[PDB]
């Protein structure tokens, strides 16, 4: 990770009211198997 | 028309009348629940959007 300072401005505020304990991410893939770009 | 009262922020509130603003004179004002008193003047502060 880069060394520096940058504050995070607010973007989204949703009135849902759910528990949320677990979470997963998603990513986009393309068939050639499949080739995925280098990312972290 | 049935109104349900649940443990929610209750987004459906309704309208509220507004009046014209006056400057350069002491006045009591309400700004969306911010109640105050004083004189309003054109400002210079660079309020970033949010
Ligand atoms: C949220 O989920 C956790 C994990 O299952 C659980 O222990 C907790 O009681 C839940 N909170 C609720 C349902 O308000």
Swiss-Prot record, chain B:
Residues 7-29 are annotated as: Disordered. Changing residue 7 to P: Increased resistance to human covalescent sera neutralization. It comes from the Viruses. Binds to host ACE2. RBD also interacts with the N-linked glycan on 'Asn-90' of ACE2. Cleavage of S generates a polybasic C-terminal sequence on S1 that binds to host Neuropilin-1 (NRP1) and Neuropilin-2 (NRP2) receptors. Interacts with host integrin alpha-5/beta-1 (ITGA5:ITGB1) and with ACE2 in complex with integrin alpha-5/beta-1 (ITGA5:ITGB1). May interact via cytoplasmic c-terminus with M protein. May interact (via N-terminus) with host bilirubin and biliverdin, thereby preventing antibody binding to the SARS-CoV-2 spike NTD via an allosteric mechanism. Attaches the virion to the cell membrane by interacting with host receptor, initiating the infection. The major receptor is host ACE2. When S2/S2' has been cleaved, binding to the receptor triggers direct fusion at the cell membrane. When S2/S2' has not been cleaved, binding to the receptor results in internalization of the virus by endocytosis using host TFRC and GRM2 and leading to fusion of the virion membrane with the host endosomal membrane. Alternatively, may use NRP1/NRP2 and integrin as entry receptors. This is Spike protein S1. The lineage of its organism: Viruses, Riboviria, Orthornavirae, Pisuviricota, Pisoniviricetes.
């Amino acid at each position: 990770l880069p060394q520096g300072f940058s504050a995070l401005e607010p973007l989204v505020d949703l009135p849902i009211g759910i528990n949320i304990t677990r979470f997963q991410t998603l990513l986009a893939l393309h068939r050639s198997g499949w080739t995925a770009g280098a990312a972290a | 028309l049935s109104f349900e009262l649940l443990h929610a922020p209750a987004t459906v509130c309704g309208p509220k009348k507004s009046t014209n603003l006056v400057k350069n004179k002491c006045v009591n004002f309400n700004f969306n629940g911010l109640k105050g008193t004083g004189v309003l003047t054109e400002s210079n502060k660079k309020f970033l959007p949010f």
